């Protein structure tokens, strides 16, 4: 009844076994045999019986060890080992930190990786150089003279220089100087950056990588930028990992110290929650991971497309091209190499994502490269699309539009920034629809498009198509209106 049945394994209580064995003894020596309390046979039989209760319980435990439920500890691995899933061991927390540095710290100075500890359990991930890792800048007040500006183009690799004179230390000349610097920076990097830099004329200060509330939010990516007169305060981004593996977590604004204080140090803080470390993996999350493995896709075109869009602080657009037949094809490509085009994804961070590529798939083509350690170190390639700005003119017949009413139309044409690489066609009819949509209902309307800088004769109505590595772009100030 309690052993193996048609519905699994059961468990007997103690009393049933006691009664059964006492009945057996009764049968052995007739109905007259005493078996309760005072019998020596009773004291032997009851003591004997309790042990087999342990044996039955252990046997019942053994049976479930080979079932979807009931497996535990070592035995659990064998069950889920058949499906190629293994527990995770000790893990080390990973994250990134930023710190402001005094105006006087030279660009070329390099922090030693093995001579600092962020806090009681964090250290530098690797060697860090101040140059090429600026994320935000603040310039205010005290800065007459001649100034040099340098920047590495984020698409090409040619350093650009600008020359200016600070004839005045305040007022409209200072405002114009700051505006010139803004125009210099925005022409490189990405247009999203311009949304995060402005001038507070009331205080005559310039903010780089902040928000309207004066909170350092950082630029779109690490860059290099210098001024021969080293003015303001600079901020840099570092990579940090924990000392020993285990469990540890830190919040969005937790890190607050460095034990050996470097000269010129100002402050230090977090930007986002760390990827917390973990202790030895437990059974519950092991089962949970085993359950959610369906979405774990890799090494396929849809998988690589999805992964990039969800693993980069940016990457607004992405597209891929294939050439796998014995020849370079029309588009300049080696015979058996893929092509990946991105927008605003950085170089190092995106490169790490590319380790989802199918093994033995050469890929590795483009204009920019990077090296990643596996152990062995290997190089990967890719390219960044070169934005092309358009100039748009709108003409119509109707009541004159009032100032601040054109804002809706101007922002309405933001759809022009949603074109895809190569396969981007304006379909001016779509623009006509949009301009007639982001407004109150209600005679005639036309749209003209031309590349920036061209003469007015270049205005046309035929749709435009992006080049192989070009992508459409548009600025709010590049919109005009005419009444007819």
């Amino acid at each position: 009844n309690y052993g193996l049945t048609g519905s699994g394994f059961n468990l007997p209580p103690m009393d049933d076994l006691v009664q059964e064995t006492k009945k057996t003894f009764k049968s052995a020596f007739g109905e007259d045999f005493n078996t309760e309390s005072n019998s020596v046979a009773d004291k032997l039989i009851q003591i004997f019986n309790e042990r087999e209760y342990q044996l039955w319980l252990l046997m019942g435990s053994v049976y479930y060890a080979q079932t979807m439920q009931g497996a535990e500890g070592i035995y659990l691995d064998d069950l889920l080992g058949k499906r190629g899933i293994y527990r995770l061991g000790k893990t080390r927390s990973t994250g990134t930190v930023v710190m402001t540095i005094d105006s006087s710290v030279p660009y070329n100075m390099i922090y030693s990786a093995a001579t600092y500890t962020i806090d009681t359990d964090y250290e530098l991930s690797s060697d860090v150089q101040v140059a090429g890792n600026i994320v935000a800048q603040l310039i205010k007040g005290t800065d007459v003279g001649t100034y040099r500006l340098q920047i590495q183009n984020t698409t090409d690799q040619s350093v650009k220089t600008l020359s200016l004179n600070l004839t005045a230390t305040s007022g409209q000349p200072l405002i114009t100087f700051f505006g010139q610097i803004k125009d210099f920076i925005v022409n490189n990097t990405i247009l999203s950056n311009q949304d995060r830099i402005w001038i507070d004329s009331t205080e005559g200060a310039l903010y780089i990588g902040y928000d309207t509330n004066k909170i350092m939010i950082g630029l779109s990516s690490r860059v290099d930028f210098r001024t021969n007169p080293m003015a303001g305060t600079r901020s840099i981004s570092m990579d940090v990992r924990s000392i020993e593996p285990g469990y540890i977590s830190r919040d969005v604004h937790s890190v607050r110290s460095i034990n050996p204080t470097p000269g010129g140090f100002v402050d230090i803080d977090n930007l986002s929650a760390f990827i917390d470390g973990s202790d030895v993996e437990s059974d519950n999350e092991y089962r949970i991971r085993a359950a959610t493995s369906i979405s774990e896709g890799k090494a396929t075109r849809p998988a690589i497309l999805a992964a990039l869009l969800n693993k980069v602080e940016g990457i607004e657009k992405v597209r891929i091209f294939n050439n796998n037949t014995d020849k370079t094809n029309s588009l300049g490509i080696p015979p058996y190499r893929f092509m990946v085009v991105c927008y605003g994804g950085g170089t190092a961070e995106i490169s790490q994502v590319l380790y989802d590529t199918i093994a033995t798939s050469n890929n590795t083509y483009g204009d920019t490269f990077y090296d990643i350690t596996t152990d062995q170190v290997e190089r990967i390639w890719h390219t960044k699309a070169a934005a092309r700005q358009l100039a748009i003119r709108v003409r119509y017949r109707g009541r004159p539009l009032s100032l601040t009413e054109e804002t809706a139309i101007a922002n309405g044409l933001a759809t022009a920034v949603n074109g895809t690489m190569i396969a981007g066609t304006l379909y001016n009819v779509r623009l006509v629809g949009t301009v007639m949509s982001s407004t109150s209902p209600d005679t005639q309307v036309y749209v003209d498009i031309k590349n920036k800088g061209q003469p007015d004769s270049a205005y046309v109505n035929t749709d435009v198509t992006a080049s192989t590595t070009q992508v459409l772009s548009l600025e709010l100030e590049d919109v005009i209106f005419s009444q007819i």
Binding site: Q46, S61, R83, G84, K298, Y355, I358, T360, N362
Partner: protein, 165 residues
């Protein structure tokens, strides 16, 4: 602080139960103790073998006489393989069911067969891939067929094995 796997031999099984002699009434009589000890010690043997009936059936320690049963359920037949490597193939094929053949992934599977530094992998431009072995502990020709299976559909592979660097 405690092991999650409760399947272990019961600690000090024998002295237990003797603890249930009421008030030392029989203790020191050397006639009842032997009778009780002889019976209880039989359960010791059965209690011990309850573990191996579960411990030894795991694929890690399963002997060839029964490992075949484990492989049979999975469709991996012995063929001409011997016990030490038959265990390896069972692990390799089973692990293949949650794989994607990436460079990082391939290194992980080879890691279980050649220690930490016993393997390295070169990569080539036109689908070429290379495998290097330094500390093989089993004969590789019989394991080779599986080593092909967990690679992309179009891989071009070379295999070279040597002892040490």
């Amino acid at each position: 602080l405690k092991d999650v796997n409760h399947i272990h031999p019961l600690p000090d099984f024998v002295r237990g139960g003797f603890d249930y002699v009421p008030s030392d009434i029989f203790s020191g009589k050397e006639n009842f103790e032997q009778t009780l000890r002889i019976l209880l010690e039989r359960l010791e043997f059965i209690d011990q073998k309850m573990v191996e009936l579960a411990e030894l059936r795991t694929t890690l320690n399963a002997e060839d006489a029964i490992l075949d049963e484990i492989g049979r359920q999975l469709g991996i037949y012995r063929n001409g393989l011997n016990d030490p490597e038959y265990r390896a193939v069972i692990m390799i094929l089973t692990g293949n069911n949650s794989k994607s053949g990436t460079r990082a992934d391939i290194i992980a599977t080879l890691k279980q067969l050649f220690g930490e530094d016993g393997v390295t992998t070169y990569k080539g431009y036109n689908y070429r891939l290379d495998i290097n072995i330094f500390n093989t502990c089993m004969e590789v020709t019989d394991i080779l067929p599986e080593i092909i299976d967990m690679l992309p559909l179009v891989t071009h592979l070379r295999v070279v094995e040597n002892q040490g660097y």
